[PDB]
Amino acid sequence: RECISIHVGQAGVQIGNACWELYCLEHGIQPDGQMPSFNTFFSETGAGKHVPRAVFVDLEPTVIDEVRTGTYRQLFHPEQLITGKEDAANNYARGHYTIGKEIIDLVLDRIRKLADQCTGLQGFSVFHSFGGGTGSGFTSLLMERLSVDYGKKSKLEFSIYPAPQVSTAVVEPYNSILTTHTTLEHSDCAFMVDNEAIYDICRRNLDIERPTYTNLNRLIGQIVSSITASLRFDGALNVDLTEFQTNLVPYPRGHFPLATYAPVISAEKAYHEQLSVAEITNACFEPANQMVKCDPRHGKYMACCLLYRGDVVPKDVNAAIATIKTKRTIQFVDWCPTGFKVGINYEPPTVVPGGDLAKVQRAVCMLSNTTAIAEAWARLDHKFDLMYAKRAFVHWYVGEGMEEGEFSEAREDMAALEKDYEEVGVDS
Amino acid sequence: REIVHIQAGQCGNQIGAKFWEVISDEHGIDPTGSYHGDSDLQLERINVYYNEAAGNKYVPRAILVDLEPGTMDSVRSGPFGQIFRPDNFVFGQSGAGNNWAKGHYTEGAELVDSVLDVVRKESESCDCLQGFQLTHSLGGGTGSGMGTLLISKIREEYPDRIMNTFSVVPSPKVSDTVVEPYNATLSVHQLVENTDETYCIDNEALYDICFRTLKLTTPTYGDLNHLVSATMSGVTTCLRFPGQLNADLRKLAVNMVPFPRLHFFMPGFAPLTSRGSQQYRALTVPELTQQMFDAKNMMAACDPRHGRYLTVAAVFRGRMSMKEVDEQMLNVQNKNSSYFVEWIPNNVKTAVCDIPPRGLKMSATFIGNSTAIQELFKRISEQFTAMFRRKAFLHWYTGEGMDEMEFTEAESNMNDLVSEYQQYQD
Amino acid sequence: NNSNELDRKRSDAGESNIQVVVRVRGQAPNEPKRTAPGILTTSGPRCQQIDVAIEAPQVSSSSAIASTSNLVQESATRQKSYHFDQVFGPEADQGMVYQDVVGPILEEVMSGYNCTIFAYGQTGTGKTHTMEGDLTSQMGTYSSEAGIIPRSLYRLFHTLELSKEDYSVKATFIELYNEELRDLLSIDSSTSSAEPSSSATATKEPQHALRMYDDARGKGVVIQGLEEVALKDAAHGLSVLRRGSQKRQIAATNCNEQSSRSHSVFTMTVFIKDKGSRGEDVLKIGKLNLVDLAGSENIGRSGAENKRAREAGMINQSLLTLGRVINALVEKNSHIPYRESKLTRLLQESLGGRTKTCIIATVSQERANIEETLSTLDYALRAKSIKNRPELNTRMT
Ligand SMILES: CC(=O)O[C@H]1C(=O)[C@@]2(C)[C@H]([C@H](OC(=O)c3ccccc3)[C@]3(O)C[C@H](OC(=O)[C@H](O)[C@@H](NC(=O)c4ccccc4)c4ccccc4)C(C)=C1C3(C)C)[C@]1(OC(C)=O)CO[C@@H]1C[C@@H]2O
Ligand SMILES: Nc1nc2c(ncn2[C@@H]2O[C@H](COP(=O)(O)OP(=O)(O)OP(=O)(O)O)[C@@H](O)[C@H]2O)c(=O)[nH]1
Ligand SMILES: Nc1ncnc2c1ncn2[C@@H]1O[C@H](COP(=O)(O)OP(=O)(O)NP(=O)(O)O)[C@@H](O)[C@H]1O
Ligand SMILES: Nc1nc2c(ncn2[C@@H]2O[C@H](COP(=O)(O)OP(=O)(O)O)[C@@H](O)[C@H]2O)c(=O)[nH]1
Ligand SMILES: [Mg+2]
Ligand SMILES: [Mg+2]
């Protein structure tokens, strides 16, 4: 009944710095391990000074030396503090094959140190990127090996997705095409998070034009604390991750949900507002709070899972269930009859010390499905197609053995995958 | 993880001499050998340039190559020369005549193994080799001759390391020699096929930059190079120091090089302003991106607005905010989309370091690649054709005896070199 | 009295462009042991036909909820029908590919036509076997039927002796190992494991003029310095070419241990002289640049080591820069960048140059190696529109 974290790449390591800070805030945990009364991400020492069940992967020495010399360094154990010699330097080819074969036998060894400790392991999550070569290559190697090692667990991926307008490196579409096709081959569930619409939340819900990668991920980190950390706790109708396998995803490969978070309240907006149930349920169906550049009106709704926080009465929700069914402009699918899975737990979300959001009595992490992402799938693909036409930036990965037959493979079957979102509302 | 430095030439030895003056200022460094910094990042990532033994000294990873005594004598006689140790100064007592056909060919050959062993003295003692930094000339012979012969050997020693060099483009405006279009054109024959990259810095713009855009009086070699020395140190900051978007030099080698022959680049410094203009200016993210578009702040004498940008690196220094950073970068992309290339959608690569250099609170480093950097080549190549018709002063090199089959081919190198920007220019 | 007699203009830049030959992997002591039992036969997906020279691979077409590669087929069809000039298979013998490709060219290059032969395909496929081959089971192998080297060397003492003219056999073997140039026809006394003297005078020797000599008389023609031609009066002296084949760098990989690691440019020069009936001596010089290539190693599939990594990548970089020539030739771009790879500077002579050449497509037969063949079918489909202009060679008085 436990769960593991994995931090791959410069993106995925920095995600957990706010996530585990919230997880220390889940139980009042100081940098020693002080907590009363819980084992999901936790092993326990003799002193009761609990340790995370996390995996640190850095081919640089750089990013972990921020962590294991800064704060919260005593909670992480040098069992977990697994760094490397040299980065792939945004190379999918070196992150997968060349530099990836160097530290992989140490990290898999730490799994047998820790997955042996798990009393009935539920699964794990993987934190990585789509653009960085550590977060793309090492993800492509490890997830295939974990399918060999644990083919009967949960393979979650909370994967940052690049904007088709705001990008930081050139080969970011050139990375994720080769990455995700082998990821669709193996992974259980993969998310997409775009900082494009997170900036839209920073300016229209947070109303602040000055973000850091902390506050761009504390928003993401507050989701994951509501995704899984509440599932050990008991509310009205508690859910676990096994109630999403054939349930959330009605097919073997449709496993790409869309996560929203409705109450995003700057601290002054506690008084031009009076929160209720039906307000934030309507706030879940804004195209301006999708957290990814997408518009659900042009797509459909195959599923909609309402995962709640705090003081929630279901009879009040049954109004808000029946509300948006009546207030729809959604073009609901033909194949799902009505299935809108209800998740109501007890705990309100927690206030980040030094954060931006306000103390709300209730919070929704809504997982939905659409073909609006199938457009936003193809938008980064059109960035990828023009580089292959000129055959630019091609000498870095052929020199580590990545063939052009992969690019007719990975792109065209990703383009074939985008055609399979269209196959939702065809036969009726 | 460690970066090796080589210096050559009457300029590049002094250009490098100004550079470690900056790096000593970077970390709180005594000339004698004691630590006087206070930042932990000065102390935590020592190993990128530095070497340690016993003796309470600062002992360099600096191998310095010359054939003149009095150049590096005056380096040693001046300050930041006693910051070296005399286990490094490998040189000869023979005038090269400022000739490419001697330092590459005859007189440098008497000094090859006395340098490459000292390379092996360092590279075998290095923990993790990552950088082979070279600083030299392309106008004289010690910089051009002795520079190219090392790259024929160190790449043979290390085929899988990073070969960067800071090669000074000659200026048609201000010079004293005559055979200046020989030291460049013949160095091109080796810098293309054996270096992973090189920069293209010309004094011809630098006389305009310090005088006009910085409001100074006389462009001095102590300050024309001081402008270069800050842009030298700005390259590998995210390698050295922590950043949100830590970009490797190999990442900089990946994303700025779509084709492995177009590895010619141009630096750019973002607060290029005078002294009195501080009280007439606030310093912002649009203020730093303002000089991305400026033609005069291009340190090579090239109009960026003539050609079109191939790739652009934005290397930032300071506590910034990304939505301000990314959108202002996006605003410039929306402003001058005609000055870019189409098949690269993300025309500008960002790179954010978390610490600005001291004295500044916001700083950045423009590193662009445009289709008008080829212009400085067409100055020297047509000169090189004019030197070939009369074969004027060929009686300094005919005794050396470098072939015409070399010299037709260095132009044939140059003809294929320039004209392929213009495939993808328009 | 008079009608119009309308006329049309011409283009003499050349229509004799290129030959594209597809001889693939096949008949071995080991390969039909495993391909035909268990998997479908000699062209399982591919459907070999030789007359129209068409071939069309597939995979199993099923309703995939994420549609895989090669699900482009229909109710009953063949797809990606890459027809070529002549496609050959396992039954193509050494004399058969001689009879169609090599032999009738070897009577056309006797008068001054020039050629360049190279192969292209996936690693471990038979690039070495097509070029080098092996001498057959004879008590005396009197230049027996083998790869394209000794069988043309059999023709070398045949048709230059059938001409009964003043000929001069000239052969120079140059390695291309990590884009360097190494002779193996040399004395190689520094190469072999020998003991230098106690007073060492030459422990290293840079001597060969290994630099390109651009003459710019025509365009594309390659000149190097200090080449060592081979003058043999019979086929017994061909064992020093076997010494070059012996000392050529090979690799022991998981994909293939018989795969050669490096590759070589081995030129031919049949310096044949005879006087014409006008009173004019005719320097008939044919050139047959017998260039073997190494394998496009899937380095993740072989699982190579660190010393094998920079070897396999630069082989892959050589084949990648080769493909950088192919798209530039067919789009007709102005400054085709030969100058990155020196092998492409060696391929200035026929890729965009003047004289003839051919391409060999030794590609794999396995079902897991079909999209690997597509990276070769990427450039084999592009291989046709390569502009050339052949010419003979003579001597003026
Ligand atoms: C009153 C005062 O202190 O003023 C500043 C200053 O205002 C200005 C004018 C400085 C000044 O620099 C110059 O005038 C200059 C001229 C030629 C070549 C190089 C510099 C300054 O010298 C430069 C210097 O800048 C730095 O210290 C940077 O960190 C810089 N460091 C050095 O160049 C340096 C070298 C040796 C010893 C001490 C400093 C740097 C920047 C990037 C990467 C590495 C280093 C400082 C504080 C100033 C003065 C003194 C006027 C400027 O330059 C730099 C490089 O910061 C010119 O454009 C900026 C704008 C600055 O505002
Ligand atoms: N939202 C968010 N995105 C990030 C963050 N850090 C990196 N990214 C994204 O990740 C991409 C690059 O991936 P990185 O994780 O930085 O690089 P990597 O995975 O370590 O692999 P390398 O490129 O070799 O360093 C960038 O384009 C960003 O879009 C972060 O802190 N927050
Ligand atoms: N068409 C064919 N006819 C006969 N034998 C073949 C044929 N194709 C493959 N073989 C056999 O398959 C073996 C394996 O091929 P091999 O030459 O070792 O690899 P490769 O493709 O040449 N690699 P490389 O040497 O790196 O270029 C050869 O030695 C032949 O014995
Ligand atoms: N910026 C700068 N350029 C210099 C300096 N000294 C020489 N140069 C330039 O260097 C070039 C000549 O090369 P040089 O290094 O002097 O000769 P070498 O020793 O034979 O390489 C010319 O373009 C000069 O303008 C100097 O101190 N500063
Ligand atoms: Mg990384
Ligand atoms: Mg073979």
* CATH class given for the domain over B1-258: alpha beta
Cα C362 to ligand 6 centre (Å): 8
Q: Please choose, from the candidates C393, C388, C391, the residue with its C-alpha nearest in 3D space to the C-alpha of residue C18.
A: C388
Helix locations, chain C, DSSP H = 31-34, 94-97, 103-106, 127-131, 148-162, 239-247, 299-302, 306-331, 342-346, 370-381
Q: Please choose, from the candidates B124, B99, B78, the residue with its C-alpha nearest in 3D space to the C-alpha of residue B9.
A: B99
Q: What one-letter code names the amino acid at B227?
A: L
Cα B250 to ligand 2 centre (Å): 16
CB contact under 8 A, C66 and A184: yes
Atom number, ligand 4, closest to the C-alpha of residue B99:
20
CA distances from B136 to B13, B167, B173 (A): 7, 6, 20
**Dist. CA B160–CA B166, nearest whole Å:** 20
CB-CB contact of C386 with C351 (8 Å): yes
Classify residue B86 by burial, with Cβ atoms within 10 Å: 0-12, 13-18, 19+.
Answer: exposed
Residues of A belonging to the active site: 243
* Gyration radius (Cα) of chain A, Å: 21
Q: Please choose, from the candidates A63, A190, A81, A85, the residue with its C-alpha nearest in 3D space to the C-alpha of residue A139.
A: A190
Where is the binding site for Mg(2+), in residues of C? 126, 129
Helix locations, B280-321, DSSP H = 285-293
Residue to test with chain B: of A14, A62, A130, most B Cβ within 10 A: A62
**A98, A404, A420: residue with CB nearest C67:** A420
CA dihedral C162, C164, C165, C166 (to 10 degrees): 100
Pull the structure tokens for residue A154. 């949960």
**Dist. CA B67–CA B142, nearest whole Å:** 7
**A398, A406, A416: residue with CB nearest C67:** A416
Query: C371 phi and psi, to 5 degrees?
Result: -75, -20
Cα B36 to ligand 6 centre (Å): 65
CATH architecture of B373-426: Orthogonal Bundle (1.10)
Long-range CB pairs of A41-48, under 8 A, 24+ apart, other chains included:
A41/A2, A41/A3, A41/A4, A41/A5, A42/A2, A43/A114, A43/A117
Tokens 């997880």: give the residue.
A23
CATH architecture of A2-235: 3-Layer(aba) Sandwich (3.40)
CB atoms within 10 A of CB B33: 14
CB atoms within 10 A of CB A291: 23
**B-C interface: how many C-beta pairs under 8 angstroms?**
33
Query: A79 phi and psi, to 5 degrees?
Result: -55, -45
C-beta of A169 in contact with ligand 2 (< 6 A): yes
Domain that holds residue C348: 19-58+78-136+143-187+209-381
CATH for C116: 3.40.850.10
Classify residue C140 by burial, with Cβ atoms within 10 Å: 0-12, 13-18, 19+.
Answer: exposed
CA dihedral C30, C31, C34, C37 (to 10 degrees): -110
**Dist. CA A359–CA A339, nearest whole Å:** 31
Query: B27 phi and psi, to 5 degrees?
Result: -120, 10
Strand, coil or helix: B77: helix
Q: What one-letter code names the amino acid at C60?
A: S
**A-C interface: how many C-beta pairs under 8 angstroms?**
74
Greatest Cα-to-Cα distance within chain C, rounded to the nearest angstrom: 100
Q: Please choose, from the candidates A219, A200, A410, A424, the residue with its C-alpha nearest in 3D space to the C-alpha of residue A303.
A: A424
Task: Write out the E strands in B308-415.
Answer: 309-317, 348-353, 363-370
Task: Write out the E strands in C163-262.
Answer: 169-176, 181-183
Domain B259-372, what fold? 60s Ribosomal Protein L30; Chain: A; (3.30.1330)
Smallest CA–CA distance, residue B291 to chain C, in Å, is 33
Beta-ladder partners of C88: C23
**Dist. CA B249–CA A60, nearest whole Å:** 13
Residues in Cβ contact with A180 at an 8 Å cutoff, skipping those fewer than 6 apart: A130, A190, A410, A414
CA distances from C343 to A177, C217, C351, C362 (A): 31, 20, 11, 20
Cα B70 to ligand 1 centre (Å): 29
Residues in Cβ contact with C325 at an 8 Å cutoff, skipping those fewer than 6 apart: C336, C337, C338, C344, C347, C351, C352
C-beta of A173 in contact with ligand 2 (< 6 A): no
Where is the binding site, in residues of A? 9-11, 14, 60, 88, 129, 132-135, 168, 172, 195, 213, 217, 241
Chain B residues within an 8 Å CB radius of A87: 248, 250
Pull the structure tokens for residue A58. 């850095």
**Dist. CA C311–CA A399, nearest whole Å:** 9
Residues in Cβ contact with A143 at an 8 Å cutoff, skipping those fewer than 6 apart: A126, A155, A182, A183, A186, A187
CB contact under 8 A, B246 and A60: yes
Neighbours of chain A (3+ CB pairs under 8 A): B, C
Q: What one-letter code names the amino acid at B85?
A: R
Give C 192-231 residues with CB within 8 A of chain B: 211-214, 216
Q: CB-hemisphere CA count at 13 Å for C217?
A: 7
Give B 273-312 residues with CB within 8 A of chain A: 311
Strand, coil or helix: B161: coil
Q: Which of C128, C301, C319, C362 to mutate to test the pocket of ligand 3 (most atoms within 8 A of CB)?
A: C128
DSSP state of A75: T
Residue to test with chain B: of A59, A98, A134, A170, most B Cβ within 10 A: A170
CB-CB contact of C130 with C147 (8 Å): yes
Strand, coil or helix: A42: strand
Domain A258-374, what fold? 60s Ribosomal Protein L30; Chain: A; (3.30.1330)
Residues in Cβ contact with B274 at an 8 Å cutoff, skipping those fewer than 6 apart: B213, B214, B215, B216
Q: Is residue C194 part of a domain?
A: no
Task: Classify domain A375-424 by CATH number.
Answer: 1.10.287.600
Pull the structure tokens for residue A257. 């949900």
Classify residue C259 by burial, with Cβ atoms within 10 Å: 0-12, 13-18, 19+.
Answer: buried
Chain A residues within an 8 Å CB radius of B328: none
Q: Please choose, from the candidates A287, A312, A311, A303, the residue with its C-alpha nearest in 3D space to the C-alpha of residue A340.
A: A303
Chain B residues within an 8 Å CB radius of C178: 159
CB-CB contact of B396 with B190 (8 Å): no
Pull the structure tokens for residue C3. 């009608």
CA dihedral B338, B342, B346, B349 (to 10 degrees): -70
Task: Write out the E strands in B242-304.
Answer: 264-269
Buried b or exposed e, range B258-290, using 16+ CB within 10 angstroms: bbbebbbbbbbbbbbbeeeeeeeeeeebebbbb
**Dist. CA B25–CA B23, nearest whole Å:** 5
Chain C residues within an 8 Å CB radius of B258: none
Atom number, ligand 2, closest to the C-alpha of residue A195:
1
CB-CB contact of B26 with B50 (8 Å): no
**Domain boundaries of chain A, sorted by first residue:** 2-235, 258-374, 375-424
Alpha carbon nearest to ligand 1 atom 1, residue? B275
Cβ–Cβ contact B159 with C under 8 A: yes
Count the domains in chain C.
Answer: 1
Atom number, ligand 1, closest to the C-alpha of residue B227:
18
Q: Please choose, from the candidates A59, A89, A92, the residue with its C-alpha nearest in 3D space to the C-alpha of residue A175.
A: A92
Residues in Cβ contact with C279 at an 8 Å cutoff, skipping those fewer than 6 apart: C397
Pull the structure tokens for residue A4. 């593991």
**C178, C212, C213: residue with CB nearest B159:** C178
Cβ–Cβ contact B346 with A under 8 A: yes
Length of chain B measured in residues: 426
Using CA of residue B120, residue B125, residue B131, residue B135, what is the dihedral sign? Answer: negative
Residue C255 gets the label, from left (phi > 0), alpha (psi -120 to 50) or beta, of alpha
Alpha carbon nearest to ligand 4 atom 10, residue? B11
CA dihedral B58, B62, B65, B70 (to 10 degrees): -30
Q: Is residue C261 part of a domain?
A: yes
